[PDB]
User: Which sequence fits this backbone?
């Protein structure tokens, strides 16, 4: 799916 | 009445002035022209004695050139072992407003006084392993600026009430009172043979006192402000006086007049401490800029700088063997240069 | 290190430990400098401040986990210029003036000159001033028939026993301060007042609070 | 200054005991204390050492583990707890004070002792066992095993004198300096590993035994002794 | 009060002085004859410095 | 389009790294600015420089690249550095707030224990607690490719109620408790300033309000979105995958440029920097 971010 | 006395005093003052001007052949700055300069002496802080928690107001070396006392405004008088930086004693004072400190030539006693008008004498080499006040020499009116041992039983003090005194520690009272100064008495220094001593006052004049008789011998005056420090030449016939106009001066005891003046155009701050070298060729001088200077006592040209302090330097001492130079300052660190 | 050098180092470390303990014990306490003028009557002042559950002399006052040290330089013939740099870390000066001495010869201008001299020393830059004005009832009883308007030049106020005599003198003593940096914690103490200790505590707390505002970047 | 020891008596082999030394007249809080025992007809032997502030403790290799030294500064007392006493501890235990700084004289004042009855090392040899002797000069010699001269110039060797029926006292510390209250007729000298004590114009109450102690490695071995008889 | 100052000035008046060049020569002589034992003017090798 | 995004990223990155390195060199090579709060300011500046030069590139580059080519070690390390630096910055902000409260609301009782030997103790305790708290991230930050070459470096949690519980723990223990602590401490400071020139007091009060509101505004969206992901899962990815989350992390790292500006570069202290 959509690229997943990394928290802070 | 008073008019005749004033006129006679003025006439005799002119007489003595013209007299000390008559026997003035040539300056010292010419007789020392055919002398090789010493170059530039750079010294590095070999030790750094820390453990005080306030300003350090005085300092004195032991005659074995190893131990040294230091007196601070936090109510402590600490006796360092300079070779290994250990502490030997930490005497707690009764009045924490101290401005002087001394160490006995034998090494048994120490002395300290301050704004409490009292010179306390602590006995180190006693039984019971403690360090207790032997005597509390009282009788001065103002603060005590300097105090220098002669024997284990005599001590000269100089106080802000315009007087010096010679106390016999055993009995406890003044045996001689040196008077004649006008302003305060800020510093004092004994001859190497302890038969005379010089004292510097705040009226821009230093005096030579005879311990035996008890009266002034000569009155040197060439400065422009108060004199904060004084020290004898190792020969015994000359002394250097540090003032607040940023100029040291070197007077002669037999020529009765001043020989040399040490001053640069960059230094403007007052002078807190003065000392010579073992030979007497150099001249250590502490300043308010937090840096020492090493003048060349025979050519008047500066020959080094000892800048390692954060705040004003207030005490400076040279060991009796000339092997080191201790300088204290108001950042609670006294360092040992070499 | 031989068998004795180790013991010498241990003794030195114990000495330094005791130095640290005594230093942290002497950092808690605060030091105040009492600088009264001539015939300002600070004897009864310190007597009162000591009786109601309060050379150089030091009076210690234990106040709510704080220890003040009233340092009184009683007998000194030292012209004040050579030893004053000892008191450069004091929290606050305590100037003690008298109100009734606007007539003695005058005496008050001497107090003004002394205040102006002490307040401008480069040592007292992190320390506030705490004026006291003793002998207030003597002013109230003496201001009659006094004609204060001839002794001090301007005195715009009324020539009677007006409150001007008390505020005019405070204005005279405040106008000698380098302005905009230092605050003067004035007070009008009588011979039989009782809140001197509380006012000193309040002024010292305010001084510490303003120093902490300046130091903690909070300004 | 004064030291008073208490304890001792007859003790069964393998029992326990506690020796208490009360100190009166000096700053007990600043003095490191020792224990020096003495067999009936033998010489001195180190036992234990407690520093100032109890921060440094040493023991002898023959009493390691079964003795325990401690000090109480508020009460001004020194305790030695002894456990499982062998039949070779029937000795009079002296208590020694000692303060160490630059220019000090340790072992200066030894107190009196308590007499029990239990029903490597720098070997030092005082070869002289008995020297006959008044008014004439006498000399005593002490030989060390290894060199006692340290790198800082100090040579740690002390001389003690014990009279018949008393406690030994400090004569000379560091082989050169004279202790306080000692008559100037005593003198000491020598070189590394060979030391000598010279007495001139002997008087009465001067006969006794002379012990040469070293203070370099902390087993603190003593000498055999040299009795001066008439 | 007033006689003390003139008395002390008279005591200091009848005083013996020498020439300046002689004092300067003695000062130089002391600065020279004792210069070989000045560990601050001519530092000693690191085998004699105790610091 | 995207020019504003990389533009703001580069602006805040350069500003942050420059300001923080300047603050570090000044407060480290001055030797006279040794106060109780300069220790906390230096620690915050160091943690802030770490935040910048550890978080910004590994957040901007892969969020555009649509993949993580940087490897497991890089992914594992950057996760732990992000986690440690955010926590140190927040705890140091709370420490500064509590020090100011103790030193402005009860100064006579704070004269006793406020010394640099206490500031250093607090700083090292903060760093140790932050390093001990953020060890869970390295435990699980494996890069597992989804599809042929995506990689997508993520902190997959071991099992359920470890994604959610840890996210909620961060939210409360690092954004509600610190936020309310700073708010209450600066409120009490403003009160005791209001009690007893008038501009020099309302200026300080307004600055305290600005500090609190910038903390809340900066670190609200990041923690909100983190919890959104941790609970609902693929909903957040479907919602704010490409563009938005970059702006959210931009808000987050804007505190890296805010902290030195509002704590050090004001207040006439920059005279010392220009002097250096």
Assistant:
């Amino acid at each position: 799916e959509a690229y997943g971010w990394m928290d802070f | 009445e008073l008019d005749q006395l004033r006129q006679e005093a003025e006439q005799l003052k002119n007489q003595i002035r013209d007299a000390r001007k008559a026997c003035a052949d040539a300056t010292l700055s010419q007789i020392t022209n055919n002398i090789d300069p010493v170059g530039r002496i750079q010294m590095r802080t070999r030790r750094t004695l820390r453990g005080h928690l306030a300003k350090i107001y005085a300092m004195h070396w032991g005659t074995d050139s190893r131990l040294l006392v230091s007196a601070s405004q936090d109510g402590k008088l600490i006796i360092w072992d300079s070779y290994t930086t250990n502490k030997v004693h930490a005497i707690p004072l009764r009045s924490s407003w101290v401005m002087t400190c001394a160490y006995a030539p034998s090494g048994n006693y120490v002395a300290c006084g301050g704004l409490d008008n009292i010179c306390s004498i602590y006995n180190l080499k006693t039984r019971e392993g403690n360090v207790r006040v032997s005597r509390e020499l009282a009788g001065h009116t103002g603060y005590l600026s300097c105090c220098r041992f002669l024997d284990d039983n005599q001590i000269v003090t100089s106080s802000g009430d315009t007087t010096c005194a010679l106390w016999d520690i055993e009995t406890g009272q003044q045996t001689t009172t040196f008077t004649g100064h006008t302003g305060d008495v800020m510093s004092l220094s004994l001859a190497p043979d302890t038969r005379l001593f010089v004292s510097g006052a705040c009226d821009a004049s230093a005096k030579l006192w005879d311990v035996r008789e008890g009266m002034c011998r000569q009155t040197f005056t060439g400065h422009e402000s108060d004199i904060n420090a004084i020290c004898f030449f190792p020969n015994g016939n000359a002394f250097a006086t540090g003032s607040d106009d940023a100029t040291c001066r070197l007077f002669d005891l037999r020529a009765d007049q001043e020989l040399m003046t040490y001053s640069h155009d960059n230094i403007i701050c007052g002078i807190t401490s003065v000392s010579f070298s073992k030979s007497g060729r150099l001249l250590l001088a502490g300043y308010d800029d937090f840096n020492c200077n090493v003048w060349d006592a025979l050519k008047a040209d500066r020959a080094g700088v000892l800048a390692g302090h954060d705040n004003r330097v207030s005490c400076l001492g040279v060991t009796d063997d000339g092997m080191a130079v201790a300088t204290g300052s108001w950042d609670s660190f006294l360092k040992i240069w070499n | 290190l031989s068998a004795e050098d180790k013991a010498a180092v241990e003794r030195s470390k114990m000495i330094d430990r005791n130095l640290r303990e005594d230093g942290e014990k002497a950092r808690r306490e605060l030091k105040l400098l009492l600088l009264g003028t001539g015939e300002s009557g600070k004897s009864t002042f310190i007597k009162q401040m000591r009786i109601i559950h309060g050379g150089i002399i030091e009076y210690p006052f234990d106040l709510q986990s704080v220890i003040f040290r009233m340092v009184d330089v009683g007998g000194q013939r030292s012209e004040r210029r050579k030893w004053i740099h000892c008191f450069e870390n004091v929290t606050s000066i305590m100037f003690l003036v008298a109100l009734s001495e606007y007539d003695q010869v005058n005496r008050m201008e001497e107090s003004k000159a002394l205040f102006r001299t002490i307040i401008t020393y480069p040592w007292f830059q992190n320390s506030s001033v705490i004026l006291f004005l003793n002998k207030k009832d003597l002013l109230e009883e003496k201001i009659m028939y006094s004609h204060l308007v001839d002794y001090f030049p301007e005195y715009d106020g009324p020539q009677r026993d007006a409150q001007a005599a008390r505020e005019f003198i405070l204005k005279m003593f405040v106008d000698l301060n380098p302005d905009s940096d230092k605050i003067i914690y004035s007070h009008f103490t009588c011979a039989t007042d009782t809140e001197n200790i509380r006012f000193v505590f309040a002024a010292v707390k305010d001084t510490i609070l303003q120093l902490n505002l300046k130091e903690y970047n909070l300004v | 200054v004064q030291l008073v020891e208490s304890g001792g008596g007859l003790v069964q082999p393998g029992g326990s005991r506690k020796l208490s030394c009360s100190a009166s007249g000096f700053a007990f809080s600043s003095f490191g204390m020792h224990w020096v025992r003495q067999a009936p007809e033998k010489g001195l032997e180190w036992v234990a050492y407690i520093s100032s502030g109890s921060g440094t403790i040493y023991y002898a290799d023959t009493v390691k583990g079964r003795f325990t030294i401690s000090r109480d500064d508020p009460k001004n007392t020194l305790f030695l707890q002894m456990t499982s006493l062998r039949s070779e501890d029937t000795a009079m235990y002296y208590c020694v004070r000692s303060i160490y700084y630059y220019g000090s004289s340790p072992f200066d004042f030894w107190g009196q002792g308590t007499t029990l009855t239990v029903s490597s090392d720098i070997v030092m040899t005082q070869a002289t066992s008995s020297v006959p002797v008044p008014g004439e000069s006498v000399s005593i010699s002490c030989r060390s095993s290894k060199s006692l001269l340290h790198s800082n110039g100090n040579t740690y060797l002390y001389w003690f004198l014990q009279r018949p029926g008393q406690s030994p006292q400090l004569l000379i510390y560091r082989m050169s300096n004279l202790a306080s209250g000692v008559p100037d007729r005593f003198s000491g000298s020598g070189s590394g590993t060979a030391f000598t004590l010279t007495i001139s114009r002997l008087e009465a109450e001067d006969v006794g035994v002379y012990y040469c102690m070293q203070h370099l490695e902390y087993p603190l071995t003593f000498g055999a002794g040299t009795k001066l008889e008439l | 009060q007033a006689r003390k100052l003139v008395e002390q000035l008279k005591m200091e008046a009848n005083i013996d002085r020498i020439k300046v060049s002689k004092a300067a020569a003695d000062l130089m002589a002391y600065c020279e004859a004792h210069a070989k034992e000045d560990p601050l003017l001519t530092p000693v090798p690191a085998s004699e410095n105790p610091f | 389009e995207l020019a504003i995004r990389i533009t703001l990223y580069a602006v805040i990155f350069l500003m942050s790294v420059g300001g923080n390195m300047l603050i570090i060199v000044v407060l480290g090579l001055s030797r006279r600015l040794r106060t109780v709060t300069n220790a906390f300011l230096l620690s915050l500046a160091v943690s802030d420089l770490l935040l910048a030069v550890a978080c910004m590139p590994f957040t901007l580059l892969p969020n555009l690249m649509g993949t993580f080519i940087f490897g497991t070690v890089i992914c594992k390390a950057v996760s732990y550095l992000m986690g440690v630096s955010v926590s140190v910055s927040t705890l140091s902000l709370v420490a500064i707030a509590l020090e100011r409260y103790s030193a402005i609301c009860r100064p006579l009782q704070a004269r006793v224990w406020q010394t640099r030997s206490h500031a250093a103790r607090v700083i090292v305790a903060t760093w140790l607690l932050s390093g001990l708290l953020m060890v869970p991230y390295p435990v699980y930050t494996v890069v597992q490719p989804v599809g042929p070459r995506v990689l997508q470096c993520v902190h997959r949690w071991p099992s359920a109620r470890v994604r959610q519980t840890w996210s909620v723990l961060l939210l409360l223990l690092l954004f509600f408790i610190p936020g309310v602590v700073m708010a209450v401490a600066y409120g009490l400071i403003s009160r005791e300033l209001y009690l007893g020139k008038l501009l020099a007091k309302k200026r300080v009060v307004r600055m305290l309000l600005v500090i609190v509101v910038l903390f809340f505004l900066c670190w609200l969206p990041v923690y909100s979105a983190n919890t959104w992901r941790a609970f609902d899962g693929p909903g957040a990815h479907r919602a704010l995958s490409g563009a938005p989350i970059s702006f959210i992390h931009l808000l987050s790292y804007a505190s890296a440029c805010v902290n030195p500006l509002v704590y050090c570069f004001m207040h006439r202290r920059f005279r010392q920097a220009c002097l250096e």
Remarks:
- The CA atoms of residues 23 and 29 of chain E lie 10 Å apart.
